[PDB]
Design an enzyme around this catalytic site. Sequence first.
Site, PDB file in Angstrom:
ATOM      1  CB  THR I   1     -26.880 -22.701 -25.500  1.00  0.00           C
ATOM      2  OG1 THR I   1     -24.896 -22.368 -25.221  1.00  0.00           O
ATOM      3  CG2 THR I   1     -27.089 -23.867 -24.211  1.00  0.00           C
ATOM      4  CB  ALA I  49     -18.832 -21.652 -20.622  1.00  0.00           C
TER       5      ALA I  49
END
Lengths: 222, 196, 196, 233, 222, 198, 198, 204, 212, 125
Positions: I1, I49
């Site tokens: 990410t 997440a």
Amino acid sequence: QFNPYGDNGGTILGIAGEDFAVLAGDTRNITDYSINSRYEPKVFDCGDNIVMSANGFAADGDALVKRFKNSVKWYHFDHNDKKLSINSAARNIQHLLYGKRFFPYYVHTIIAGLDEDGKGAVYSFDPVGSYEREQCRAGGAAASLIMPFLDNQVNFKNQYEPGTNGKVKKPLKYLSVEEVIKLVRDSFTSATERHIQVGDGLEILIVTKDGVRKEFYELKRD
Amino acid sequence: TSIMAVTFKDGVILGADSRTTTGAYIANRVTDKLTRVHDKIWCCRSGSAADTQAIADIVQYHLELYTSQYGTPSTETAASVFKELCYENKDNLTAGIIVAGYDDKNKGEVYTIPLGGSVHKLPYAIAGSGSTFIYGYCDKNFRENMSKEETVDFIKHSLSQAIKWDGSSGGVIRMVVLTAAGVERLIFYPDEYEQL
Amino acid sequence: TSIMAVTFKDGVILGADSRTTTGAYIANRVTDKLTRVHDKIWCCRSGSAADTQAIADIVQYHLELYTSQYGTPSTETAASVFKELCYENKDNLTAGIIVAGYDDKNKGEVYTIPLGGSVHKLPYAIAGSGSTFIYGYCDKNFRENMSKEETVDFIKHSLSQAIKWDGSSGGVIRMVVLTAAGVERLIFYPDEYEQL
Amino acid sequence: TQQPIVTGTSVISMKYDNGVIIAADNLGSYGSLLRFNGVERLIPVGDNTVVGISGDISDMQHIERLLKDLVTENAYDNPLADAEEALEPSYIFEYLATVMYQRRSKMNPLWNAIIVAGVQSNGDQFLRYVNLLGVTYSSPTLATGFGAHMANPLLRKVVDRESDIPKTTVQVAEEAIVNAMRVLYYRDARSSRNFSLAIIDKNTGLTFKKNLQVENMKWDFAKDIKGYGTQKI
Amino acid sequence: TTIVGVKFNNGVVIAADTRSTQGPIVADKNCAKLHRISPKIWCAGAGTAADTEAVTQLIGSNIELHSLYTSREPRVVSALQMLKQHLFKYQGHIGAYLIVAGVDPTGSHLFSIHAHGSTDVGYYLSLGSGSLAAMAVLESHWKQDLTKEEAIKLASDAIQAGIWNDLGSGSNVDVCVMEIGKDAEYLRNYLTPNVREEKQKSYKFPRGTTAVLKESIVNICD
Amino acid sequence: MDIILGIRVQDSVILASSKAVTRGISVLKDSDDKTRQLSPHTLMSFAGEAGDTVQFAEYIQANIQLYSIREDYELSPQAVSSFVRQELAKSIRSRRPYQVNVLIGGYDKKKNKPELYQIDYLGTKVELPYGAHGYSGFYTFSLLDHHYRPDMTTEEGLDLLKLCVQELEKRMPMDFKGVIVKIVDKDGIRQVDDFQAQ
Amino acid sequence: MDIILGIRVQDSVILASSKAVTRGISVLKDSDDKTRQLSPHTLMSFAGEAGDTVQFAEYIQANIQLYSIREDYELSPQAVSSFVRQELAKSIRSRRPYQVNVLIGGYDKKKNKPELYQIDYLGTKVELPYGAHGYSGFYTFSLLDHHYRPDMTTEEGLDLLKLCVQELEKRMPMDFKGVIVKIVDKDGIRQVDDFQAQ
Amino acid sequence: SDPSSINGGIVVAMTGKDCVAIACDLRLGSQSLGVSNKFEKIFHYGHVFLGITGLATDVTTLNEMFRYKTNLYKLKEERAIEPETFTQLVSSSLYERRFGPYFVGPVVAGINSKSGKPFIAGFDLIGCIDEAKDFIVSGTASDQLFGMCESLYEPNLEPEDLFETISQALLNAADRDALSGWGAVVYIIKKDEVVKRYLKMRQD
Amino acid sequence: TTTLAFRFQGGIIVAVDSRATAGNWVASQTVKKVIEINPFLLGTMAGGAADCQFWETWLGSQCRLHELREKERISVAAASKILSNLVYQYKGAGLSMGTMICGYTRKEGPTIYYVDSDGTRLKGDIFCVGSGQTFAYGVLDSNYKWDLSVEDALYLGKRSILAAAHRDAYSGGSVNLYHVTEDGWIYHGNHDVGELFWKVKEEEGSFNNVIG
Amino acid sequence: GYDRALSIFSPDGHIFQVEYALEAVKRGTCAVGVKGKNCVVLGCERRSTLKLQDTRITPSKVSKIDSHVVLSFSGLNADSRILIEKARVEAQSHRLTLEDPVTVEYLTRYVAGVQQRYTQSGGVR
């Protein structure tokens, strides 16, 4: 020492069409190197045109599906029989999974149906509630074998127009229910060939504006 | 430790060695392992001494209160109370109890509650570290409905063998006889049982 | 495993069950644990099967070479070779051997080599996981100078008890009789010994 | 969290044209010590259900007590307790499954593997499994522990799929079960020769057979086996 | 893996399934597990694949050399003794578990060998993950004095038990019959009950579908 | 760790605190002010565990501002330091302790004297002419032991700190990105905006 | 770890290496040259385990100087890098491995082209336009990925490195005390003594 | 920790009608850091092709070792080594380091110059041969490759068609693996000629 | 990410990638890592997440409650502190989140707050969070000016995420852009790295090391 | 444990305990407040039932809740302390979580909420 989790194998597949959606799953249930059952349903019609599957540790998968079905029931009771939209079911499921953030339901869950505009919809979840709406998604034991295939045949990844020097991507024409069923069956015959936890049978649930239909196909039993 | 209970014609007899150790040291060579929980209900203890004594003391309490309200308790009921304590607290206990009692209706009975907290009604039972050495001997020489003299002999021979091979067992052999006639305490010294 | 060797009037007899397990699974239910290292010198093996087979094979080798140079070896000498291998390699071995042989001068003899590699000459010996259950029985029923029939009965009764209580033992009971008359192979099936 | 102490081995079963069959030996093991021999591991509930339990025996006895209570409780203020409102095999299973899953969820399991066999009120055969993890499943044949590895393969040669059920008789089925019990006695070191067998027929009812014994065993070929490789005598 | 050995009135037979795996993935759907030690001494292994193959070829090579040196046919007890002494020396680090069968001037033989170096003799044996399913069959049907044909059936039936009930086994059945007075006969794919059904679609791509960046000829000739 | 230094001269207490905030492999910020004003004449600097640091400082600030409003009075530096010590001492024996070290510099308007308190996460309090937390002390206490005098002026104090910072920028492994310096005296708290090159 | 950077431009290879040597809590030296000349047109920089670093470098230098005398010739950069790779590859499977990462910059006089080789302690070799070992790459490879061009001049290369060093001095936790820069081209090896502010 | 997941990379080989294909990605990383996008994993000795995945240092050492051995082989035998023979050489060379193994996943591709028969084979790190007729896969995205190959593959494909198949299998497998990708090269092999093509793919 | 946010003349740029993983397995290439807290607040996600999604969605509900109660838009400072204090309550339990809360209020002007699961809360002009943060920092730090055109800023942000998507194995998929102004945020599209990379290579001449 | 309902409705719809609470306010010293264009002024009257007090220490009628807000009252002095303390605590809590001092309306709404709660909670007047 006691381990609260187990692995029952199995693989599930969800594909969204323009005005329909399918959720498939093999019917084999296993423990280590033994078969517990050749036919143990893993995909369920939960009411309101929603199909669900929580794959991984079966005990956890059953508890979740059971709890969701009960959630749908109470939704009707508390909101004058209002129909639970697919997007609403997804959010509800996130809270169900995150409720056990510190002692997770060891499952990869997928639900399918139609959104409020009549279009096909598929949602996949993390064991703790992370979710996203998608075009297609494979989960479980053979997910790593199937997903790449689906990226190629459903979303036409890495495919270009012949003669365009890889300058023009193959157009995203959408699939019919007949074409989707073909991909599902092929995905599972391939998965059955290369993964020892996949086989015995394939059960597919199709969702259209007319309700839920079911189709069954044999798979190799070795 | 070597303990056993044997039912016979007139009732039941409990027997045990008298050795308690902490490692290789004999902390007590004249221990009394035959524990009274009621007039005619007794038990043989094995495992943690702290644990079994605490359990026995509580069972005695429960049976005294039971008696005050409903009269004499059956041996089965006594075994049930032991079980309830051993099963429900299996994580924090290391106790192997043999329960034996005499009822006028049921005569003599024997129940064994091993480590997990399960219960087993048996014609006779053996427990303790020394019991492993006499499984064959006891299975070959036990008969039902023996006389008092025969039973005493059976226990005496069995335990002397258990004491012979198990370093954790030893000292004197104690016995408790339970019949309609009453309660009798027997003791047998090394110089006797060693030469059997 | 349940194994034993018993000296008697005419010589010595070796006996064993026939069960070999890997966990709870019976990998072989008709194993032959009576191992020949010389015409009239045999042994019973317990512990690691790989280890004991390797030791026996080497001992057999040593005794064949011994014979070629100096004639028939004494049972004591065979026990010595087993010992040398077990003691010197105690760190990498898990072997419990019972050695038994018949000599015309010394008659029948029994040597037990337990885990550490020490040696013990005895009137009779028992070993294997199942032996713990028959210590009392064997100590109470063994007598010196028994007849062939009596010895066979002693072993048969002893091992049936060992098999009765030890899950690691079972199958058929095999025996080897060593006397001036020769070598005799005996086998006894469950339907027989189970009802003793 | 715990650890099993006194234990029961395999529990095997299968369904035939008119009902279900379930069996389990009578042993209570204590590690490698074959400690107890008069242990009944098949629990009849009413006259349409039999619960076979393996694993920890102390927990089995607890489950036994739970079952007797379900019967008593169901009879309370229930004038139809021996008719339309009697306990169904499916009610008994769901109950145990619920309990099993709650106990594992509190990290304090009932260390068992259970098979519930019975006939529903409408004649349907009932065969389902549940264990200490709360895991459940159904199949024409079911076995726990060792029987899962050695019994299912033999029982599945008789009923390999659903369509084989109606073609299978009580005689064929019981024969298959009995042979399986013999095989388990040959290769499972924690098994016993004595066992119990129960049949739940939609017509003949419940037949509970006690004190059966493995018979017709082959051991003779053992006399010819000698040594472990090169030994000749 | 499922391997079995069965002795009959005038010889011995061995058989195995054909599934090779890497964890839960099937790498080879039809590999041959029956190896030759010598013309009439055959072998089958379970455990570390590289080890069973290497140990088989090493002892095989030495057996051939021994045969040439002594001007005699290889004996099964020699292969057994060489294999076990080799494995023992390696204290189980060479993960080879084998069933060795064969015929020689002294008769027919059947043995099992474990990684640590121990051996067994018997009339019927099984090894591998499918070991228990196969043995359930052998314990139910074996009998003394089987005919060559009954043995082929029994052995073949035992492996099928493994193919169907053990996840670590599958595909085909291979057999090798060794009879006292004749040549050994290897029957590759003696049974093929697991043929992949025809796929629902053809995935042949239209030429030019893949984008290329650069192309060139490779020189092979020196 | 972060750099926390303090020094009490003739009529004031000077606090110097590093400006870097580093998480793993990256320096996320280089202008971090590791201080909270507890009252007009009391300042507290802090260093330690990531989240606990500010949470503790702000918690203490809130309690002192509350005391100030309720009593319409300002607690003496010694009183505040004692309150802070008790809070840390309670924390070390709780479920999850505040892993925070602090320096409290205050000017006691009643005694007309500056005061410097050093308190570690265990609730260990001591009053000193100069102090530091973490590895800083290992290089600065010997410097100050050598160059410190009780009658130094606020200006001499600043030159003494400059000397300390230079030593830290020479021998310490980490780049702490300079310090922010604040002075506490009879007139309150002011920040020396010009230390990046004084 | 230490900073090791390399970049191959049009007609030369530039190597930049940090000058600090830190042991525990103290920066023991701030002018350390982490490089060894292997031959007149081949330079090697290195970083890693305390003692192994120099011992490996000097060992390689000795072997190359020996080859040069015996043959009265200079091995090509590619040849030298292959020799160095084999040595590291042997080491990873020995009793006690050399935990050393290196960059080899050389100018091949036969091809008339500069070359840059990156080799880690495992014997992993790759030829690149620019390289780095340790944490440096995490901040520099994206910079170079953006600003690098094959036809850059030695001067444009130096401005590119200056950019890399500034990013490292901004985001990296440790004070590596600047870098020593050396240029390798058709005329040999020279050191840019003026980088402390170029 | 796992030597086989430090650098990343994949290789796949397929047989067709009188031809064979061997392909590989070009990535070489160090955990999450991508280091080189030109690390090819396929080599050839004469007409025999070898692909190697796993620890990069061993990939390089093995290539040098096999170049060394095939060179001597040619000098002594006076002919180029064949696919079948080379496969045995790889196997025995790997088993020789049974207790101090090279952490790799070798793959052999080629056509026997005498029988014209297409050949492929795979091995685990200690030499076990996998001789499938259809395809062999290796690398950090091996599960994905098995999935693609089993689905896309079909017998007797023509060189031009096999190229599209092997490529799509490689590309889509690589895109579901974080440690694979960053470029790819495909080799189409025929008795007489060999064509090498670099594919265009995602660069993330 | 890889996520980033920076302040400049035209306000705030927010850019994130869209890859989700589970080990070396690429779980998704189409994940939303920016949640529109509300018409004027943006939240970025890195780490767990589920943790990010669940709590940032929860944050929105708490922000809406504030506006109903106080009849006024919540400040960026108060919003970021709600998440920060919540996360602090759970310290040590295992939550995993690296986040940026970005907004624009009349009272504070363009504002960015970094908030993580350790309980750290920092106000600042530039932040890159995620496994690819260093790569973005590299490109972003060497081309930043407070005086960038909304157009040039959007590009720098997009370019920075691209840099990270290329070098970080755990970053990729596509780039999602946002521009923050007092009247709210403006979505600036989804850009697949698949096409974005080549386009940028050709038009910019960078990534010279890759062959195309 | 004490939870008797002290504030309840009477037949005519009144809550007498609340009404009588107002009577206690009518009995308190007078307090006034007037807002200017750039200020607010608070005035209070001082009783004279007893005079010989020490003005330095006797608690004043106007209290600061925070540096920018004050509160005066009429009624029971002891009761006012409870409200003042709670208000002061709430003011600091607000600065701690919102990073901004309370608005006057917010602080008022808080104090009023406390008063309302004491009109429909068991066991309190």
